[PDB]
Homo-oligomer: A and B are copies of this chain.
């Protein structure tokens, strides 16, 4: 780790010792360096993958400081190998240029669904800038330029910023505070040149989709989500799989729901089952039947669901929106099952006590939550009733919890959680407002 680097340190010292001169097979030390360099570049790729998945709501508690430290350490080994000292010279100098180019990274990625005529930010950071730049020579200027997928295989304003040192900051960065721009993918190339003969630095951003406000971004959001999720580390720019495993998809979705909604309760296997039924148009109640399936892009955002007028992602993002705006605390409190069929509800609820209810998302509309519940009398015969789905607007007028209370028929949330636990003069006759079922 740092242990291997420890080796590299020990060797320089020896060749230093072996320098009197009062054989040079030690410069397999250059190889030992080269190996260490490839190694870092690998870590740098790993961090980018991590950052790409964070675009989708993955946990990214990764600082770039560790990668910097290591990079600086390798340069220190290089300088020593250089000062000590044929052909190896080309070699080390090759180590250096490689490292330097790999050290220029986008650190704050820009909005990946980006609207025109809207203010945006990105930032690029150079890991080795605290070895090669600084005060004597003027800071190199980093440009921002939008590019097509075609160009990246090789309109923005406020696109130039100096790449600057912070000794307090312990970094070299250029941050664009004030950027504005005036299915189809593109990127921002960030560009700077510097001599330490002059080298040109390029960072390519994560892919973007540019939209003009309204209408807007459901499609664009699906695209970013697919690319972020299913991308290959070493891909040719903006190429993704068309089909992916459903298990990978389910994951991607759980992370998404958590991020958007704002909750740490995710989706279960039981949720994935009802999801899978919908995406695949299947009714098996076995998680086994859906565990090793493949998903395509079409199934996800292109083929409209059976008996519906929307896609699967349109539906899913519809529930995200709804949950995020109205339902977030209810979802955290585990008051909503949410993803369950009307059909399976009937099975769960038929044997239950009168007044037992559950909360699901509407299968048939976008952004809907409905009440399903069991009604049974003294004859003992159960009937299930499904109350029409509520929307975001309906939920503004009166909240879900209020509506649940308004109803005397409703007694316990499944399974047996009392509705009251679970949910939070002068001569005038009282009037009240209650939700009412016909």
A interface, CB within 8 angstroms of B = 342, 364, 370, 385-390, 394, 397-398, 403, 425-438
Contacts and interface: CB of A to CB of B under 8 A. Distances in A.
A398 B428 CA distance: 19
A129 to B, nearest CB: 40
Contact of A388 (B389, B394, B431): B431
A438 B429 contact: yes
B431 A435 contact: yes
Given A342-B427, A397-B398, A435 B432 contact: yes
A436 B428 contact: no
Given A387-B431, A397-B433, 19 more contacts: A342-B427, A364-B426, A370-B428, A385-B429, A386-B428, A387-B428, A387-B429, A397-B397, A397-B398, A403-B431, A429-B437, A431-B435, A431-B436, A431-B437, A431-B438, A432-B435, A433-B434, A433-B435, A433-B436
8 contacts: A387-B431, A390-B431, A397-B398, A431-B437, A431-B438, A433-B433, A433-B434, A433-B436
A370 B430 CA distance: 11
A162 to B, nearest CB: 30
B433 A437 contact: no
A53 to B, nearest CB: 38
Contacts of A390: 431
Contacts of A428: 370, 386-389
A389 B427 CA distance: 11
B429 A436 contact: no
Contacts of A394: 433
Contacts of A437: 429-431
A427 B403 CA distance: 20
A189 to B, nearest CB: 39
Nearest to A426: B364
Contacts of A431: 387-388, 390, 403, 435-438
A191 B397 CA distance: 52
A364 to B, nearest CB: 5
Contacts of A370: 428
Contacts of A435: 431-434
Given A397-B397, A397-B398, A432 B436 contact: yes
Q: Sorted from nearest, which 10 A-B pairs have the closest CB atoms?
A: A388-B428, A434-B436, A430-B438, A364-B426, A386-B428, A432-B436, A431-B437, A433-B435, A387-B431, A387-B429
A436 B430 CA distance: 8
A396 to B, nearest CB: 8
Contact of A386 (B386, B429, B438): B429
A435 B426 CA distance: 20
Nearest to A407: B431
A433 B388 CA distance: 12
Max chain B CB contacts within 10 Å: which of A389, A425, A430, A436? A436
Contacts of A433: 394, 397-398, 433-436
A286 B273 CA distance: 77
A436 B408 CA distance: 15
